[PDB]
Design a protein around this ligand. Structure first.
Ligand SMILES: Cc1cc2nc3c(=O)[nH]c(=O)nc-3n(C[C@H](O)[C@H](O)[C@H](O)COP(=O)(O)OP(=O)(O)OC[C@H]3O[C@@H](n4cnc5c(N)ncnc54)[C@H](O)[C@@H]3O)c2cc1C
Ligand SMILES: [Zn+2]
Ligand SMILES: [Zn+2]
Ligand SMILES: [Zn+2]
Length: 750
């Protein structure tokens, strides 16, 4: 007794039963109720009853299904859910480029990714027609409707994907909560021996960098796609599938064409899903979640639609951030020029390649926490290996004695309790009450000695000094410059989990790949940035002018501080306050080649050894020596000068620094002979005019917020990236890289 849909504002002139399950099916006629799934998809009450009522013959099928559904999912197992999960026909799009018509498949045909890839109109049960005349039959008029605004509004139930590539990573979630089907027999990390790809948080898991909640839409996602606010399921299913596809093949661009065949769901909704996967892809690409790293893009090929292509950008600095942003923008199809002061790219990445059998970094060479680390992604993309550091680091004393592990551990413990008293002391203190971390530590240690009567030996004091110099190394400063309140501010945010590694082939392999074929001008030090006009006007020191709509600054913090780039309009007081609130931390490195591996019998394959400092005054003077060949075949050691020791070396030439280091080595290996080095370098980052630092840290009275402030764009035309702009991940090549990706996403938007 009804031929119109049950639902208000349904646009279906003629509801038709897709089910035809009952002999008594209402077909294209009247029923007591026309059950709505979509504007183009209904079933009659007779067919409803065919499954739902215990006396009808479709009851076994429904009840069986409902059991599976209930034991696997958290969604109500209605007849509608059953119809959409098990009964609706599959729709597939003709892959002939001149055709592209969507076709409904006959009730019995099971869609597979192979059908999706090869489909042409008129393809019968077994997969290609004689002529392509089947293509000329008009498209069901329902197809055109799917892409309406009000069509999605009238979906009563969300799509649930079958055999999602994401499934194996979402075992811990209810499939439906994550946009997958509770009935697919399908019911951790992405496949790989390194295990570095862990894109999803486990249920209620936090504290792991770059993980995404597979069951929740973030704010940046709801803002881009607000149509999903009532039910995120569809977005989540497609975003999750997209992440899983990207990580299973990170070496090629992930396109809609690659995703289409992996979206298996019944009904007209599959069309909506196919039409959305494109938009979601573009969002995620822009954001740098996929289609990123050192992805090789064709000259003609661009990752974003021509819509984004009417922008030009000057990027200042060809370090990791500058190159990350340049690669992204260039891949997007945006016109980018990189201006670099030095005669090379890389910035604080600078690899020496002249030592036989190893590559040794003058700057960065460690990766701290490889899980979800873009550096590990780019390593994967390049098929290069990293070396995970071993645990063992003997503290050798001058004279040759190896410190007892219990002393090392006891004084490591006490070092950490000192840090805990500091974090106790500071919780209530304001910025204006900040005290140098070094002062706080010395104070606390004194009060501990005093009101406990505990007294440490000389050796114990010296081991404590070793652990102290590690923090100085980590901060890139003597602790008397470092904020007690804020030194580890970034630790508040999820950090990168997993391996700490030596990047054996060096960061330069990554840096060079990122830079490949980009418009990079070397020895083009920027002196002036003028954005007061319609275009940004950039002028190098020699006077060459460049203009673009947008400028990205990635110069080291020390260079901003020294005001090497004139900004007009000048930077805000707020920005300058932030800039000066951060310290330009410094370490220097020494590499030493020896005729043979003299240290092997004492060190026994460890990746590094420590140098117990003879005094507080010497503590950062070559505290750790790194065996630069994890293959244990070549003989190159590297060491580090940190803390007050960096100042001490400023007046020494390379040979004296070398002699100092050899004297150290001779003392550590006092009982034996140490051969002279055949080759070395000593770095001088602090007097390198375009760098003048190693990495930022928060000065006394500073805040981690300074990192966000430096990162804030001006007027949507001047953008900042770099290590010193990454609040979550300061200091590292990783953080620098991600800052550049961050800015390209900002720049590519509007
Ligand atoms: C000795 C040392 C050891 C380190 N150890 C590690 C490590 O193990 N792991 C790790 O992750 N990080 C390490 N770091 C830090 C890491 O190298 C930096 O955080 C990272 O290189 C910063 O990248 P960036 O793009 O922000 O800046 P940079 O790498 O400093 O690049 C900025 C570019 O800006 C250019 N520039 C400056 N002024 C101008 C101008 N006026 N015009 C044009 N160009 C200009 C510079 O020449 C430079 O090439 C180390 C650094 C040093 C120095
Ligand atoms: Zn029916
Ligand atoms: Zn309807
Ligand atoms: Zn066709």
């Amino acid at each position: 007794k009804y031929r119109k849909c049950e639902k208000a504002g349904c646009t279906a002139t003629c509801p038709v039963c897709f089910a035809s399950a009952s002999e008594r099916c209402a077909k294209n006629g009247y029923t007591s109720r026309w059950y709505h799934l979509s504007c183009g998809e209904h079933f009659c009450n007779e067919c409803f009853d065919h499954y739902y009522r215990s006396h009808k013959d479709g009851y076994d099928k429904y009840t069986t299904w409902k059991k599976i559904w209930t034991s696997n999912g958290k969604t109500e197992p209605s007849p509608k859910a059953f119809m959409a999960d098990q009964q609706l026909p599959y729709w597939v799009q003709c892959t002939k480029p001149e055709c592209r018509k969507w076709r409904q498949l006959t009730k019995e045909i099971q869609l597979t990714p192979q059908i999706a890839k090869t489909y042409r109109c008129g393809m019968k049960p077994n997969t290609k027609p004689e002529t392509s005349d089947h293509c000329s039959l008009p498209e069901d008029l329902r197809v055109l409707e799917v892409s309406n605004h009000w069509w999605y509004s009238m979906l009563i139930l969300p799509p649930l994907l079958k055999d999602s590539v994401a499934a194996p990573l979402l075992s811990a979630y209810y499939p439906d909560c994550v946009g997958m089907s509770p009935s697919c027999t399908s019911t951790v990390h992405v496949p790989g021996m390194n295990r570095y790809f862990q894109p999803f948080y486990q249920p209620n898991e936090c504290g792991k960098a770059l993980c995404v909640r597979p069951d929740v839409m973030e704010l940046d996602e709801l803002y881009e796609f607000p149509e999903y606010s009532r039910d995120p399921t569809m977005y989540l299913a497609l975003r999750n599938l997209i992440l899983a596809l990207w990580y299973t093949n990170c070496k090629e661009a992930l396109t809609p064409q690659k995703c289409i065949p992996h979206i298996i769901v019944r009904g007209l909704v599959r069309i909506r899903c196919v039409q959305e996967v494109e938009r979601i892809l573009y969002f995620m690409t822009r954001k740098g979640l996929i289609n990123t790293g050192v992805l090789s893009v064709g000259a003609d090929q661009y990752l974003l639609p021509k819509d984004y292509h009417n922008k030009s950008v000057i990027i200042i600095g060809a370090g990791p951030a500058g190159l990350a942003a340049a690669r992204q923008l260039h891949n997007f199809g945006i016109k980018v020029t990189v201006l670099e002061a030095k005669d090379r790219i890389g910035g604080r990445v600078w690899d020496d390649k002249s030592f036989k059998g190893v590559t040794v970094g003058r700057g960065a060479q460690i990766v701290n926490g490889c899980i979800n680390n873009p550096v590990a992604l780019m390593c994967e993309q390049l098929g290069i290996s990293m070396h995970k550091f071993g645990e063992r680091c003997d503290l050798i004393q001058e004279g040759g004695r190896i410190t007892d592990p219990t002393i090392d551990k006891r004084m490591d413990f006490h070092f950490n309790a000192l840090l805990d008293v500091v974090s106790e002391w500071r919780k209530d203190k304001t910025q204006l009450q900040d005290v140098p971390l070094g002062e706080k530590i010395e104070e606390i240690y004194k009060a501990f000695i005093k009101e406990s009567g505990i007294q440490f030996s000389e050796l114990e004091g010296q081991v404590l000094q070793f652990h102290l110099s590690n923090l100085e190394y980590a901060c890139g400063s003597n602790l008397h410059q470092v904020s007690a309140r804020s030194w580890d501010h970034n630790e508040f945010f999820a950090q990168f989990a997993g391996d700490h590694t030596l990047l054996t082939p060096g960061y330069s392999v990554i840096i060079e790949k990122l830079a490949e074929g980009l418009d990079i001008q070397l020895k083009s030090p920027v002196q002036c940035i003028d954005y007061s006009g319609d275009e940004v006007q950039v002028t190098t020191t020699d006077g060459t002018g460049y203009s673009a709509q947008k400028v990205l600054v990635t110069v080291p913090l020390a260079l901003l501080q020294k005001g090497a780039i004139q900004f007009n309009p000048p930077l805000s007081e707020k920005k300058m306050k932030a800039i000066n609130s951060l310290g330009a931390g410094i370490i220097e490195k020494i590499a030493l080649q020896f005729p043979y591996r003299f240290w092997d019998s004492k060190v026994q394959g460890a990746d590094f050894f420590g140098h117990v400092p003879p005094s507080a005054s010497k503590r950062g003077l070559f505290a750790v020596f790194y065996d630069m060949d994890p293959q244990k075949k070549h003989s190159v050691l590297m060491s580090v000068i940190a803390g007050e020791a960096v100042a001490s070396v400023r007046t020494l030439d390379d040979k004296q620094v070398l002699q100092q280091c050899m004297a150290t080595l001779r003392e550590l290996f006092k009982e034996q002979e140490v051969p002279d080095p055949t080759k070395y370098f000593v770095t001088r980052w602090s007097t390198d005019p375009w760098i003048q630092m190693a990495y930022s840290f928060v000065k006394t009275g500073g805040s981690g917020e300074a990192y966000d402030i430096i990162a804030e764009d001006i007027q949507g035309t001047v953008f900042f990236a770099g290590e010193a702009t990454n609040r979550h991940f300061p200091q590292t090549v990783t953080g620098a890289y991600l800052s550049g990706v961050r800015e390209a996403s900002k720049i590519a938007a509007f």
